[PDB]
Curated annotation (Swiss-Prot), chain A:
This is Integrin beta-3. The constitutive activation of ITGAV:ITGB3 on neoplastic cells may contribute to tumor growth and metastatic potential. Changing R143Q: In alloantigen HPA-4B. The gene is ITGB3. Changing L33P: In alloantigen HPA-1B. The chain holds residues 27 to 507 of 788 of the full protein. GO terms for cellular component: alpha9-beta1 integrin-ADAM8 complex; alphav-beta3 integrin-HMGB1 complex; alphav-beta3 integrin-IGF-1-IGF1R complex; alphav-beta3 integrin-PKCalpha complex; alphav-beta3 integrin-vitronectin complex; apical plasma membrane; cell surface; cell-cell junction. It is a single-pass type I membrane protein. Residues 267-287 are annotated as: CX3CL1-binding. Keywords: Calcium, Cell adhesion, Cell junction, Cell membrane, Cell projection, Disease variant, Disulfide bond, EGF-like domain, Glycoprotein, Host cell receptor for virus entry, Host-virus interaction, Integrin, Magnesium, Membrane, Metal-binding, Phosphoprotein, Postsynaptic cell membrane, Receptor, Repeat, Signal, Synapse, Transmembrane, Transmembrane helix. The keyword Calcium applies.
Swiss-Prot record, chain B:
Ca(2+) 3 binds at D348, D350, D352, F354, D356. FG-GAP repeats lie at residues 1-67, 78-139, 142-194, 206-260, 261-326, 327-384, 388-451. The alpha-V (ITGAV) integrins are receptors for vitronectin, cytotactin, fibronectin, fibrinogen, laminin, matrix metalloproteinase-2, osteopontin, osteomodulin, prothrombin, thrombospondin and vWF. They recognize the sequence R-G-D in a wide array of ligands. ITGAV:ITGB3 binds to fractalkine (CX3CL1) and may act as its coreceptor in CX3CR1-dependent fractalkine signaling. ITGAV:ITGB3 binds to NRG1 (via EGF domain) and this binding is essential for NRG1-ERBB signaling. ITGAV:ITGB3 binds to FGF1 and this binding is essential for FGF1 signaling. (Microbial infection) Integrin ITGAV:ITGB5 acts as a receptor for Adenovirus type C. It is a single-pass type I membrane protein. The chain holds residues 32 to 623 of 1048 of the full protein. Belongs to the integrin alpha chain family. The constitutive activation of ITGAV:ITGB3 on neoplastic cells may contribute to tumor growth and metastatic potential. Disulfide bonds join C58-C66, C107-C127, C141-C154, C460-C471, C477-C534. GO terms for molecular function: coreceptor activity; extracellular matrix binding; extracellular matrix protein binding; fibronectin binding; integrin binding; metal ion binding; opsonin binding; protease binding. GO terms for cellular component: alphav-beta3 integrin-HMGB1 complex; alphav-beta3 integrin-IGF-1-IGF1R complex; alphav-beta3 integrin-PKCalpha complex; cell surface; cytosol; external side of plasma membrane; extracellular exosome; filopodium membrane. It is found in: Cell membrane; Cell junction, Focal adhesion. The gene is ITGAV. It comes from Homo sapiens. The keyword Metal-binding applies. This is Integrin alpha-V. Glycans are attached at N43, N259, N265, N457, N523, N584.
Length: 481, 592
């Protein structure tokens, strides 16, 4: 028949299978000379070909870990499961495609980690006063949602260098508030204070002994603190199995990368942890501010949800910044931080009201398409996200993996993961672009004439110079007429 | 496509940021030409000054030795008994270097001074101007408007440039609560009014931007500067980048060069992209109108998937007679490479008739050692496909090499007629000079006397026997030319073979007469600019008993190769063939 596989003279199985996914190959020598060895699967059975001889590999997806979704987050940490199936293996042919489904559930009562990162410029003295007992109030409110709350604290002002820092008289270095006849701490870049702990009373104990500082310019060095609180896992104390909330409170504009050049800092931010045993960000005066791209990368790697709790005068600015950083939300902070608790509680609700998927280590030969079955049994095509959810909701995505060619490496596993969650689905892709019969072909086979060609999968494959179906002659010396 | 890759490397003291700022020095008093390299952190011999920085003058010929040029040799001045008037330590002298003819301008953006009214440390910034045997200090921002709200934190000299009319342009991004400021003074006034005993000098013909409303604070006007005429009056106008303006969207201001009146504004598209980090004004498409280039090193692009990634972007705006601008954008090629960090007009690199521009990605490339992209101008604008890639060679000691962080071109140091390029690698304290190779344009001719070969024609005689065989003549010609310094005559190796399309090891139809071969090789010497030099060879077809194929037409293929080794000049710089001209030519002939 005029099938696609018959449109060209494929050399052997190695090429017959690569023509199209429904092409098939017959290896029997009894195959009549008038029947092409490459054709549709059913055709080879209409002709004389042993079913066991027909190779015709097919694509499949196998589930390897298929633990059920958990009900509530409390209990054994190793048992809580939010994504199923956890591992699947894909075998597929060149330019082939397969479909598999992934279910995502936001389990209730999940452990939560809150790191409170606070701006301590002079305008935040009243804010610091108002939150002196936020630990107990925060513990009381979060009790309705999670039973394993942990909280921590940290502070930032700006890079302690000119022109940001006061250096004019000698005494201003020790008390930058001298000219207004009052005392305050010397400026500091970033300062880790309290490691994430479930002793909420320690949050009250530690925040009462903090003091504000004073810088010259309006923009703050917050992004340095955001970077450091992310990549310093050991000191901050992030739990691998928990929801990570990074609360960032400020009432002023923010410095951005390449601003440090004015201060003589030209070294790009490396994204490493530089918080020493004194809990101060040592590289503050040496490394430039991080860029939004690096911050986003590090947040994604560590599964951190960043919340901007900023005052009215900068809410629009931080909303625009959040547009560029997936997994972040903005809230309006009062001029004295009196509403920070409700802001945090609302932000936590919004964060777990949305499911978004991300992929890592995807081979360049593969492409993915997503169909989202958000909420009830209705599908929104072409979306890898679903919104309007509530804690406990279960969402299902349907994914199609598409090939491009046939890579030399036959295993290029990759990962599919919801944003902000540790649980992930690992795809063990195996490119099946090969023929098993090739390994047992006779080299320099006398099956062909004079050993001129290898007997590849039931058909001659001539060596250099030789031609012909039986590899009879070294030259043609042949006329169709 | 013509920069050489056997360059000259200059090394400075370790940790000096040698190569942070680079420029050429072309004094009119002598034929010698030198490089200028800034080392803002270099320790100096100034009494009691630590890491004051210095500028080094490196010669190209001879041993290629770098030596400092003494702008200043004194410590901090005293306002009164043991109370310093200045703080030169860590002043970053040489962070910006610009020269024009025999004038050298270098600035120290981080120079702090103790105001005359109070004991203070305000980074006003200072510059030094050397015009031959005489040196004068120039600190426009060291005025009596001393405060953060005035221009005490001006950091004057953060960026600088020279206009055609011997007028300086200086930008201080810290004036007026970091709104920024542009200050322009005539070089004549700067020199003639200098007085070492006056600390706040007033220049009569100064042009400076004034303070604005508080909404504009922290805009950093003057972060980068450039000059070019944008209203058609012969006077260079001022172009400055404002990376933090418009809620950090970035902005670029153009000010009239005669009265500092505003002309145009450019605005960025993405927040925090630092649109305006670098700016350049050069004519890229053969018009009298200069074109504006703006860099956005941190611009985040959206890949095939919806995920954003930081690649950088450069905005190209072609000036039009009506005052409008036609804008197109180039995106970076690698993530976190900061494409667009530095932009350096190259002049007409290959003498194509259109100026060329270089764009740097100091953190891209393998091992993140830095990459520089060369783009060629066209009548329709800039060619969006880079014609060459320059890669950093030195690995990091303790800091990214930053190869390409600073660049400068548009000057022909070896007088071969093609402008060269200097690239800074302050991360490893090195600067490298790339020389432009002469470009040779070649036109190749190839034809066969009979278009169609009839086999019954037997005019030619088989040499060495009485046989008569059908024959034909193939004539090939070679003409070469190129601007700049080139040898008068060039050697080309011409390779001829026929029946090329069917050369699968099978039978060959045609054959050369005298050599009895299907191929021919001739070493041909051609003189630049001469008429088409030609040679002719006689080839014939084999008898009918040899081959059957009467369908596939006979094909003639020609390939020529330039002998670069001989054509190299006395300094070892080899020419190069034009990129677009094909390296081969072929013609078809039928058999009947």
């Amino acid at each position: 028949g005029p099938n696609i596989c018959t449109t060209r003279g494929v050399s052997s199985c190695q090429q017959c299978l690569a023509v199209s996914p429904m092409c098939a190959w017959c290896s029997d020598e009894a195959l009549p000379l008038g029947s092409p060895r490459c054709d549709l699967k059913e055709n080879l059975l209409k002709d004389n070909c042993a079913p066991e001889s027909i190779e015709f590999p097919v694509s499949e997806a196998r589930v390897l870990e298929d633990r059920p979704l958990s009900d509530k987050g409390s209990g054994d940490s190793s048992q809580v499961t939010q994504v199923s199936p956890q591992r699947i293996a894909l075998r597929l042919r060149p330019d082939d495609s397969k479909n598999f489904s992934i279910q995502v559930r936001q389990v209730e009562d999940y452990p939560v980690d809150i790191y409170y990162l606070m701006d301590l410029s002079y305008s935040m003295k009243d804010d610091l006063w108002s939150i002196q007992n936020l630990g107990t109030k925060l513990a009381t409110q979060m009790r309705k949602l999670t039973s394993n709350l942990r909280i921590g604290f940290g502070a930032f002002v700006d890079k302690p260098v000119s022109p940001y820092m006061y250096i004019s008289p000698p005494e201003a270095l020790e008390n930058p508030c001298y000219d207004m006849k009052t005392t305050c701490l010397p400026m500091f870049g970033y300062k880790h204070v309290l490691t994430l702990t479930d002793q909420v009373t320690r949050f009250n104990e530690e925040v009462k002994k903090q003091s504000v500082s004073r810088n010259r310019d309006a923009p703050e060095g917050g992004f340095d603190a955001i970077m450091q609180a992310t990549v310093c896992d050991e000191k901050i104390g992030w739990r691998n199995d928990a929801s990570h909330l990074l609360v960032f409170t400020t009432d002023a504009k923010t410095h951005i990368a390449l601003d440090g050049r004015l201060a003589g800092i030209v070294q790009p931010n490396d994204g490493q942890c530089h918080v020493g045993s004194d809990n101060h960000y040592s590289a503050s005066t040496t490394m430039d501010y991080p860029s939004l791209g690096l911050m986003t990368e590090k947040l994604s790697q560590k599964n951190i949800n960043l919340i901007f709790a900023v005052t009215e005068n900068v809410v629009n600015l931080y909303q625009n910044y959040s547009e560029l950083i997936p997994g972040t939300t903005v809230g309006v902070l009062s001029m004295d931080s009196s509403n920070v608790l409700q802001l945090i509680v609302d932000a936590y609700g919004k964060i777990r009201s949305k499911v978004e998927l991300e992929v890592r280590d995807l081979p360049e030969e593969l492409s993915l398409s997503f169909n989202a079955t958000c909420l009830n049994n209705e599908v929104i095509p072409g979306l890898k996200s679903c919104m309007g959810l509530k804690i406990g909701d279960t969402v299902s995505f349907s994914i199609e993996a598409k090939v491009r060619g046939c890579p030399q490496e036959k295993e290029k596993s990759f990962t599919i993961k919801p944003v902000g969650f540790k649980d992930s689905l690992i795809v063990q892709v195996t490119f099946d672009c090969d023929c098993a019969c090739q390994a047992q072909a006779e080299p320099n086979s006398h099956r062909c004439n004079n050993g001129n060609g290898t007997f590849e999968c039931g058909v001659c494959r001539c060596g250099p110079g030789w031609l012909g179906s039986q590899c009879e002659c070294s030259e043609e010396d042949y006329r169709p007429s | 496509n013509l920069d050489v890759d056997s360059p000259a490397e200059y090394s400075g003291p370790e940790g000096s940021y040698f190569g942070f700022a680079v420029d050429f020095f072309v004094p009119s008093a002598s034929s010698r030409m030198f490089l200028l390299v800034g080392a803002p952190k270099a320790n100096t011999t100034q009494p009691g000054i630590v890491e004051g920085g210095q500028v080094l003058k490196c010669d190209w010929s001879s041993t290629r030795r770098c030596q400092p040029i003494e702008f200043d040799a004194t410590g901090n001045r005293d306002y009164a008994k043991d109370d310093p008037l200045e703080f030169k330590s860590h002043q970053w002298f040489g962070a910006s270097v610009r020269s024009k003819q025999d004038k050298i301008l270098a600035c120290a953006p981080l120079y702090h001074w103790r105001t005359e009214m109070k004991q203070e440390r305000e980074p006003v910034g200072t510059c030094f101007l050397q015009d031959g045997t005489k040196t004068v200090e120039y600190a426009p921002c060291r005025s009596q408007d001393i405060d953060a709200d005035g221009q005490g934190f001006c950091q004057g000299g953060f960026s600088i440039d020279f206009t055609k009319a011997d007028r300086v342009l200086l930008g201080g991004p810290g004036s007026f609560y970091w709104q920024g400021q542009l200050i322009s003074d005539q070089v004549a006034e700067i020199v003639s009014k200098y007085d070492p005993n006056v600390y706040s000098i007033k220049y009569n013909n100064q042009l400076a931007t004034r303070t604005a409303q508080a909404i504009f604070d922290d805009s950093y006007l003057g972060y980068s500067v450039a000059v070019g005429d944008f209203n058609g009056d012969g006077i260079d106008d001022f172009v400055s980048g404002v990376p933090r303006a418009a809620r950090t969207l970035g902005m670029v201001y153009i000010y009239d060069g005669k009265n500092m009146s505003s002309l145009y504004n450019f605005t960025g598209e993405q927040m925090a992209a630092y649109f305006g980090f670098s700016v350049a004004a050069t004519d890229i498409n053969g018009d009298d109108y200069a074109d504006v280039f703006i860099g956005a090193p941190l611009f985040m692009d959206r890949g095939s998937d919806g995920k954003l990634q930081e690649v950088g972007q450069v905005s190209v705006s072609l000036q039009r007679a009506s005052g409008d601008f036609q804008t197109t954008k180039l995106n970076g090629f690698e993530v976190f490479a900061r494409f667009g960090s530095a932009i350096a007009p190259l002049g007409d690199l290959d003498q194509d008739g259109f100026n060329d521009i270089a764009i740097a990605a100091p953190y891209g490339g393998e091992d993140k050692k830095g990459i520089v992209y060369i783009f060629n101008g066209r009548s329709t604008g800039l060619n969006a496909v880079p014609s060459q890639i320059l890669e950093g060679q030195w690995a990091a000691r303790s800091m990214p090499p930053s190869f390409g962080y600073s660049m400068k071109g548009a000057t022909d140091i070896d007088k071969n007629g093609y402008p060269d390029l200097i690239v800074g690698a302050f991360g490893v304290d090195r600067a490298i000079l790339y020389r432009a190779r002469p470009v040779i344009t070649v036109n190749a001719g190839l034809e066969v006397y009979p278009s169609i070969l009839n086999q019954d024609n037997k005019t030619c005689s088989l040499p060495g026997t009485a046989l008569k065989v059908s024959c034909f003549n193939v004539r090939f010609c070679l003409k070469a030319d190129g601007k700049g310094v080139l040898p008068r005559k060039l050697n080309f190796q011409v390779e001829l073979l026929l029946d090329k399309l069917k050369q699968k090891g099978a039978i060959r139809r045609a054959l050369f007469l005298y050599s009895r071969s299907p191929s021919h090789s001739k070493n041909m010497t051609i003189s630049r600019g001469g008429l088409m030099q030609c040679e002719e060879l006689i080839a014939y077809l084999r008898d009918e008993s040899e081959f059957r194929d009467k369908l596939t037409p006979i094909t003639i293929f020609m390939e020529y190769r330039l002998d670069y080794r001989t054509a190299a000049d006395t300094t070892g710089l080899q020419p190069i063939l034009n990129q677009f001209t094909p390296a081969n030519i072929s013609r078809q002939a039928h058999i009947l």
